Amino acid sequence: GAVATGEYRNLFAEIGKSEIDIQRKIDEAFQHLFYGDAKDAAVYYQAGGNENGPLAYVYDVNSNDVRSEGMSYGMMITVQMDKKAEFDAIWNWAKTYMYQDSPTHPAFGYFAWSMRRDGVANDDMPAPDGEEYFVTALYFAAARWGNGEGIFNYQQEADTILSRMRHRQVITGPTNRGVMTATNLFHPEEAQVRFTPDINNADHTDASYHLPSFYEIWARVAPQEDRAFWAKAADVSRDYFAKAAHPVTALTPDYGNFDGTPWAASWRPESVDFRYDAWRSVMNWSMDYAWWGKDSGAPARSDKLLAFFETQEGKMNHLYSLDGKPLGGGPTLGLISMNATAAMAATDPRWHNFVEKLWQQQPPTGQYRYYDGVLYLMALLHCAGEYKAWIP
Numbered sequence: 001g002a003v004a005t006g007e008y009r010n011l012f013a014e015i016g017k018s019e020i021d022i023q024r025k026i027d028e029a030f031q032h033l034f035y036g037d038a039k040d041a042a043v044y045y046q047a048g049g050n051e052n053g054p055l056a057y058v059y060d061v062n063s064n065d066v067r068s069e070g071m072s073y074g075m076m077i078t079v080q081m082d083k084k085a086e087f088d089a090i091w092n093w094a095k096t097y098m099y100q101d102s103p104t105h106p107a108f109g110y111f112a113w114s115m116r117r118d119g120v121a122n123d124d125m126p127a128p129d130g131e132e133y134f135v136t137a138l139y140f141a142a143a144r145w146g147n148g149e150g151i152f153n154y155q156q157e158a159d160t161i162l163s164r165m166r167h168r169q170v171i172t173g174p175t176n177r178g179v180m181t182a183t184n185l186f187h188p189e190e191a192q193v194r195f196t197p198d199i200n201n202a203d204h205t206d207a208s209y210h211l212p213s214f215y216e217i218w219a220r221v222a223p224q225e226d227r228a229f230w231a232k233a234a235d236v237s238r239d240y241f242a243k244a245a246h247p248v249t250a251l252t253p254d255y256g257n258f259d260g261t262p263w264a265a266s267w268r269p270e271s272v273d274f275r276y277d278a279w280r281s282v283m284n285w286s287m288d289y290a291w292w293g294k295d296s297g298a299p300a301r302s303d304k305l306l307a308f309f310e311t312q313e314g315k316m317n318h319l320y321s322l323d324g325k326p327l328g329g330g331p332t333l334g335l336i337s338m339n340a341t342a343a344m345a346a347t348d349p350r351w352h353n354f355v356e357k358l359w360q361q362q363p364p365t366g367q368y369r370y371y372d373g374v375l376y377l378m379a380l381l382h383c384a385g386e387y388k389a390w391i392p
């Protein structure tokens with residue numbers, strides 16, 4: 001695995017691209033998304049500052065809301081790209097405005113998943129893959145830059161947040177939406193991330209939230225009393241992808257049950273299909289395989305998913321039944337980008353075509369560029385051999 005060797009595959013170099021052109025492609029994507037035209041290209045906004053220095057956020061330009069996921073992805077992108085100033089400004093806004101510090105609030109220890117640009121929460125409850133990326137990005141920051149003090153003691157922040165994600169108690173109290181009850185972010189017996197800590201829907205998961213590549217980091221550097229739990233979560237997630245991904249297409253549903261079956265949310269029953277969340281599952285298991293080499297099923301799964309998408313050439317949808325029926329939409333940059341990341345584990349040389357398709361793309365513009373753009377820039381970093389485990 002790359003962590004053992006320190007050698008991360010440069011999949012773009014493997015399909016013949018020069019290092020100068022790979023650097024240009026990543027820098028163009030960063031400059032567009034972080035510093036491009038505010039109305040058409042950028043998803044990052046400089047939002048003044050406070051006692052900790054500059055504030056900034058990554059946001060969904062469509063709804064015009066800040067998302068905890070996009071903040072956490074901005075932190076991961078910026079630490080992988082050695083962009084400390086941008087990292088610190090995003091983290092300052094997330095910790096200042098999104099993090100719930102009241103111990104009587106049911107979201108204590110968690111980041112509001114959806115927040116207006118003025119800091120008014122739409123929902124105090126979290127999207128738990130945001131927390132997973134925040135903690136990991138903070139550990140990576142500690143490793144690359146060393147720890148600062150206060151909110152910039154990245155390792156201390158990560159330890160405290162991650163401990164509370166596991167050990168949170170049930171809290172009932174007032175929220176922006178009325179009285180709510182929430183629990184921990186990982187089920188203590190299943191050792192799986194929840195879709196939500198809201199007690200009304202807590203005993204569910206989401207395959208795209210399963211991040212065994214990161215749980216292995218936490219198994220090494222988290223508070224000692226939790227390391228066995230995070231190690232377990234990594235093994236459970238590898239088993240989860242084996243059960244949750246269709247046996248023929250390797251498509252996963254957006255939302256799921258702990259036993260691997262798809263879950264139809266009452267408010268979103270189409271969550272049983274492969275949609276916007278599920279795009280990411282293949283990145284998660286392929287990254288885990290490339291880093292750690294433990295998910296013995298990952299190569300075949302990535303091969304099945306790329307074989308399936310090869311049947312869709314010239315008629316690509318972005319919504320599918322798990323058995324591979326197209327359910328609508330055309331090609332998206334986010335799905336192209338995630339499919340390319342399957343090459344971190346695929347064995348069949350059709351993966352070349354998927355990495356080449358990502359290489360051919362341009363940075364996204366217009367109303368849907370937030371999800372397309374964060375996935376694009378993460379996929380470019382993975383495929384350039386520039387998305388690494390920075391272990392403190």
Ligand SMILES: O[C@@H]1[C@@H](O)[C@H](O[C@@H]2CO[C@@H](O)[C@H](O)[C@H]2O)OC[C@H]1O
Pocket residue numbers: 113123125126127128196198200201
């Ligand atoms: O109260 C809970 C809501 O907070 C939860 O909202 C979800 C949070 O993650 C987002 O990615 C989803 O889009 C959003 O629906 O839904 C479940 C409910 O119990």
